[PDB]
Amino acid sequence: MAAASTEGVISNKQVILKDYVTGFPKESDMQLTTATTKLKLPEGSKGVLVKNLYLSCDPYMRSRMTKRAASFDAGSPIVGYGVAKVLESGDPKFKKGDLIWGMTGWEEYSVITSTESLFKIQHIDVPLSYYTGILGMPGMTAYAGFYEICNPKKGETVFVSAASGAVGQLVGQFAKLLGCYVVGSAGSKEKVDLLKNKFGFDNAFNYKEEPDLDAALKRYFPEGIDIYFENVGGVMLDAVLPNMRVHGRIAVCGLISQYNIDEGCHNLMYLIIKQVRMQGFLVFSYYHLYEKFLEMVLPAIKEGKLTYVEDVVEGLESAPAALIGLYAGRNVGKQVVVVSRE
Numbered sequence: 001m002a003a004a005s006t007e008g009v010i011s012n013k014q015v016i017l018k019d020y021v022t023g024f025p026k027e028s029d030m031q032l033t034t035a036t037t038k039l040k041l042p043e044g045s046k047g048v049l050v051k052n053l054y055l056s057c058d059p060y061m062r063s064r065m066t067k068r069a070a071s072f073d074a075g076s077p078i079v080g081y082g083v084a085k086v087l088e089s090g091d092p093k094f095k096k097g098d099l100i101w102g103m104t105g106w107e108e109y110s111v112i113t114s115t116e117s118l119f120k121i122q123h124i125d126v127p128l129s130y131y132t133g134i135l136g137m138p139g140m141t142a143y144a145g146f147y148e149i150c151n152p153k154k155g156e157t158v159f160v161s162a163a164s165g166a167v168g169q170l171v172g173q174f175a176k177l178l179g180c181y182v183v184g185s186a187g188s189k190e191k192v193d194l195l196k197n198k199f200g201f202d203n204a205f206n207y208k209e210e211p212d213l214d215a216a217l218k219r220y221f222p223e224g225i226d227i228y229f230e231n232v233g234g235v236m237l238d239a240v241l242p243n244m245r246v247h248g249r250i251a252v253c254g255l256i257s258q259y260n261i262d263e264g265c266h267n268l269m270y271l272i273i274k275q276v277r278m279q280g281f282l283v284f285s286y287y288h289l290y291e292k293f294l295e296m297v298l299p300a301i302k303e304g305k306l307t308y309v310e311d312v313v314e315g316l317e318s319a320p321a322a323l324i325g326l327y328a329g330r331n332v333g334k335q336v337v338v339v340s341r342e
């Protein structure tokens with residue numbers, strides 16, 4: 001038996017970063033703990049006290065576990081994108097019961113000191129977890145990278161790495177809707193089948209089973225690649241470079257094969273031979289397009305023109321393993337943690 005607190009103290013489970021990470025992250029680099037909270041905003045707060053509902057696992061989070069976005073603080077909760085319910089607000093834009101997405105804590109209850117970088121959700125006729133993926137930062141990344149960086153055109157050939165993931169699965173669908181020929185690489189038969197059968201990619205292959213990536217790309221792109229949407233780097237980038245078309249483009253979205261350990265790109269001469277534009281981008285520079293993105297994507301989801309696959313795990317207790325799993329390809333589609341459905 002446990003008495004209720006006569007001071008309104010309740011339990012707040014948290015995922016702490018125990019210490020900074022070298023090499024690949026391990027579950028034991030994080031600690032599940034139970035903190036206490038009074039569900040009350042600090043005096044003068046212009047922010048929100050929220051109940052966290054869903055948390056995103058995103059590849060960039062590993063970089064914040066290295067001591068030097070600013071690093072995570074050892075001894076403090078992991079932070080990252082999530083979907084939350086407002087309990088109390090210092091900003092009358094938000095009231096109790098409103099749903100938000102934005103950066104929040106890996107904990108049951110967070111205080112978010114400023115609301116300037118929160119989005120108030122209005123459309124709730126989709127799974128709320130979508131606001132960590134297709135309707136959040138990964139969806140924005142796919143939209144900006146494909147439409148704003150790749151200068152895509154009907155009939156162009158498109159190759160996507162990590163193609164069944166949060167970003168890649170949308171890039172391929174956008175490209176198919178534009179009338180492009182689209183191929184994806186992924187790390188399992190299950191993901192290759194998902195690309196062809198759920199997302200409508202023209203083709204896909206399992207890079208882990210291909211000893212000769214150049215021959216795999218030539219199988220699918222006998223006249224080369226107009227657009228490479230780069231999520232992985234490493235061996236796949238070297239294999240792609242000789243297969244680019246003249247005036248081809250490489251949108252450098254991510255390089256996840258290098259996030260935990262080093263790797264040299266050896267085929268850059270093909271940028272000259274094929275007059276290729278290889279261009280990095282950050283989703284943050286395109287958030288001004290978010291409302292225009294939602295005007296396109298919401299009806300497309302409703303009409304079944306776009307679809308999405310999430311990997312959902314239950315409880316904060318699952319969050320450390322779900323985050324480390326990104327670097328092993330454990331996720332099938334966009335990795336979500338359910339902290340609380342309501």
Ligand SMILES: NC(=O)c1ccc[n+]([C@@H]2O[C@H](COP(=O)([O-])OP(=O)(O)OC[C@H]3O[C@@H](n4cnc5c(N)ncnc54)[C@H](OP(=O)(O)O)[C@@H]3O)[C@@H](O)[C@H]2O)c1
Pocket residue numbers: 058059060137138141162163164165166167168185186187188191231232234252253254255256257258281282283284326327328329330331332333334335
């Ligand atoms: N603003 C930005 O520029 C921006 C924003 C968001 C994301 N990104 C980048 O976009 C990429 C995809 O993000 P996402 O959220 O869509 O992740 P995701 O694809 O849902 O998950 C990561 C995937 O990476 C693949 N992977 C992991 N280690 C690998 C390796 N060593 N070699 C090849 N593939 C590996 C795995 O897929 P397989 O099973 O297929 O191997 C894994 O499922 C990441 O590089 C991320 O950093 C950049």
Ligand SMILES: COc1cc(/C=C/C(=O)O)ccc1O
Pocket residue numbers: 059060069253254282283
């Ligand atoms: C949002 O996701 C990403 C962001 C970055 C870079 C951020 C910065 O340089 O400020 C890199 C890879 C990512 O997946």
Ligand code: NA
Pocket residue numbers: 155156157226
């Ligand atoms: Na073409």
Ligand code: NA
Pocket residue numbers: 256257258259260261327
């Ligand atoms: Na990695």
